[model samples]
Target: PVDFTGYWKMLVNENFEEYLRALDVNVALRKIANLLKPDKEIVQDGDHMIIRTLSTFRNYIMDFQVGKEFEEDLTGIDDRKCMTTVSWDGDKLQCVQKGEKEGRGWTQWIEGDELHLEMRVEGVVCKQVFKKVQHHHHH
Candidate 1:
């Protein structure tokens, strides 16, 4: 199984600005996110996880058990609007956001040292690439 339990730095958030615009995000928020590099911290323990996307302006926390249905709240992403559920499709992590917009969500996978993230909303697809790095800690 592919293990995705580590810290990942956002390398390329392609079409991120366009994605936000499609989601009705404000110009200021889009500008901020475009420049900021968010760190994705995922702690995968068996089937449970505490995933966090951290940044200066915004942060998204997703704590849930795999295979179980849980509400995924998009707080800073769209203020207060939608929720979703995440599950494991083999080794790939799949998420489905249920809201006003139909067919929305993302899937994540780890290939070699590269991390692939796919986000979509209203037929607009956005891809984000990240590279895995060794954890930095004090000896």
Candidate 2:
């Protein structure tokens, strides 16, 4: 089983602007998004997972259960409604989103101390690599 509960910071982002452009994101927001590296924090509780993507310009969070489909309204990314489902494929976590867009989905996996994310929209696929950060807890 793959455990993805950790804090990660983006190290490399490839073709993210192209992915955004495929989504028809605003030019200004796309520029800002391209300039900033996003952070991801994931917490897994049993069959449920909470994933958060943090950035200075925008933030995205989603909570879902494994192997269950739910309606998702992407407010920050594309502002569209989609039926999303996530499942584990070996050590990788794969997500399938059925909506207005074609070939929209993502896959996440851990390699060494880095987390790899492949975001797909239309025919554009963006690859993002994130390094694991030290976990900190406050009392």
Candidate 3:
């Protein structure tokens, strides 16, 4: 299992607009989301975790554990009712989302020195990469 505890900064976001469209997100929100950069604050304890997505436009915080199924409200991402579950595949964390538009899956893993997140729905896929805190000041 991979330890995902970190403060990560986004270095790239690819096909985000198309991915949002596939999820039926409205244009206004989609446009706003496209302009906003996402930063992650992930806290991990065994299989229990809290993934915090911070953005200038909005923030979404999810509390979940690996191997547990829960109703995902899409509170900050959109308006939808979905069942979500995540599991560990060695070093990667994979998510499966079932909703009105089923077959949405995403995965996260560390590649090289960066954290990679890939989102997929319908025929659209978005990939984002993040870097761990790059600099620090010692007191």
Candidate number of the best TM-score? 2
Q: What pairs collide in candidate 1?
A: none
* Full candidate order by TM-score, most accurate first: 2, 3, 1
- Give the Cα-based TM-score of candidate 1 against the true structure: 0.89
**Cα error of candidate 1 at position 96, Å:** 0.5
Residue-level error in angstroms, candidate 1, position 90: 2.0
Residue-level lDDT tens digits of model 1 in 1-139: 7777888877888788877888888888888888887778778898888878888777888888877776666778876456667888987999887887767889999888788999998888899888887876221
Name the TM-score of candidate 3: 0.92
| Candidate 3, superposed: residue stretches over 4 Å from native | 134-139
* Residue 28, candidate 3: alpha-carbon lDDT: 91
What candidate 2 gets wrong by more than 4 Å, as runs, is 135-139
State the C-alpha lDDT per candidate.
0.80, 0.90, 0.86
Which residue pairs come into collision in candidate 2?
none
Q: What is the lDDT of residue 124 in candidate 1?
A: 88
lDDT of 3 at 9: 87
lDDT, residue 75, model 3: 71
Candidate 1, residue 33: the lDDT equals 83
